[PDB]
Design a protein around this nucleic acid. Structure first.
Ligand code: CA
Ligand code: CA
Ligand code: CA
Ligand code: CA
Lengths: 129, 130
DNA sequence: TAGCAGCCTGAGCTGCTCAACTCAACT
DNA sequence: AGTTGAGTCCTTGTCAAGGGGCTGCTA
């Protein structure tokens, strides 16, 4: 890479023996707080996230939120649950969801969903606006 | 406002149902995690040199965390251009940031004084090879 | 084998300015 | 004020694919 090519040459220009990318330095990123805003709250108590591109971070999000707010029912309406997780993955968003317990549907919110009976939502645990 | 969002909004109202759109936020934590950083160069002085072109938010935090977590390590930056601003129309240059934080830096080339400096013990004890 | 971490300034043009961008929230 | 979070499938080839692309742990 540009500077890497140049500074390597600039050092050898002075006879000095450098070490290039040999040693790795480990370190921690401390825990942090974040907030997720699901797209839709039906009067059923059902949260609906509309998702087009659905990447690694986002998956973890839904997984963390689920561990962290076991009472919340958050379900995904995919643009296309056929999409693959990443370049030539065998796995579809679909495959991933079912394997993880995530209720999902495609392009539209199904009737059964809306037709479901009311559940208490803990606004206690959430933040408005 | 966005493709499916436009569509599923209309699809609900098509049925009379009153939905709530983006009103409630759900807080959550990301737990601590382990990572590793590989500085570009280790001089025989014991000086670590990172060559940096574009140097963004994450990277700054990296260098700041590593410094908190490995007080013995001397890691300094040779910028492609320390004139670069942190982000769209920031008043701050990578340079400004470095000095305000204690980060020793230079531009395009490793200065002589740097290499000319005397030897320091490096704790390879705390590091990982390869 | 899968899955994800950890990397990475040159064009291109007005010595700066662009690789997306736009509101919200945090500090 | 200044910095960072959080959120955003619709365009380019045979539905599908698909984001930059490579190397290289870690289970
Ligand atoms: Ca959203
Ligand atoms: Ca969404
Ligand atoms: Ca490097
Ligand atoms: Ca570098």
């Amino acid at each position: 890479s540009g500077l890497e090519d140049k500074v390597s040459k600039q050092l050898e220009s002075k006879g000095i023996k450098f070490e290039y990318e040999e040693w790795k330095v480990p370190y921690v990123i401390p825990a942090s707080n974040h907030t997720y805003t699901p797209d839709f709250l039906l009067p059923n108590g059902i949260f609906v996230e509309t998702a087009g591109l659905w990447e690694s971070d986002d998956r973890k999000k839904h997984l963390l939120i689920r561990e962290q707010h076991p009472e919340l029912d958050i379900r995904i309406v995919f643009s296309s649950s056929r999409t693959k997780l990443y370049k030539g993955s065998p796995t579809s968003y679909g495959e991933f969801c079912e394997k993880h317990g995530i209720k999902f549907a495609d392009k539209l919110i199904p009737a059964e969903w809306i037709k479901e009976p009311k559940k208490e939502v803990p606004f206690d645990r959430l933040k408005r606006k």
